[PDB]
């Protein structure tokens, strides 16, 4: 299977034709996506198999082949880029200044960009190209618009 670092689509042939259910990040031999994309199921990469290694429904994250490797964090001040990978469409960068989700357990950056469900797992990057989290777990606000948390894991 392909193990080159980068962004990948997560597909299935269970439904009509070939359907994109989400997106993920290959870094340091580990595949990273949101839990709601795969529900923790095994994945295929060519003739090879990727088995789940860590996951957490509340964080809405999952890693395959090894432990979570992404540990960059939003600086709380600068614009970031969503590397959106929409279904049937080329990877495209969108630059934005994150807002904030304020919770009882601390504040999290959030991006106010609305893409199809199959875009979940797309990476959000800082100016150095480091992945500061994944897009796709968020909320629908008053005017009906979508806002995603910048969801990041812990590197043990």
């Amino acid at each position: 299977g392909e193990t080159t670092d980068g962004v990948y689509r997560v597909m299935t042939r269970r439904l009509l034709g070939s359907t994109q259910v989400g997106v993920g990040v290959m870094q340091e031999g580990v595949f990273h996506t949101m839990w709601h994309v795969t529900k923790g199921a095994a994945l295929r990469s060519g003739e090879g198999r990727l088995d789940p290694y860590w996951g957490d429904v509340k964080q809405d994250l999952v890693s395959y082949c090894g432990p979570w490797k992404l540990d960059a964090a939003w600086d709380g001040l600068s614009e970031v880029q969503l590397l959106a990978v929409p279904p049937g469409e080329r990877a495209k960068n969108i630059q934005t200044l994150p807002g904030i989700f304020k919770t009882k357990d601390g504040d999290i950056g959030a991006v106010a960009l609305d893409y199809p469900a199959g875009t979940s797992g797309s990476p959000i990057l800082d100016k150095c190209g480091r992945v500061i989290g994944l897009y796709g777990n968020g909320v629908v606000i008053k005017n009906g618009s979508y806002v995603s948390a910048i969801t990041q894991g812990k590197r043990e």
Partner: protein, 39 residues
């Protein structure tokens, strides 16, 4: 049976399209990983 297909490198793009606002929201996160607005 889910499978993955490469879509690109992870890099910052100079002069990318710039959009989106920056809302400050009070939210709650439940045990099922669902966010909701706190009012």
């Amino acid at each position: 049976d889910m499978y993955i297909e490469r879509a690109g490198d992870i890099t910052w793009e100079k002069d990318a399209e710039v959009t989106g606002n920056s809302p400050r929201l009070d939210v709650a996160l439940d045990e099922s990983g669902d966010f909701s607005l706190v009012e």
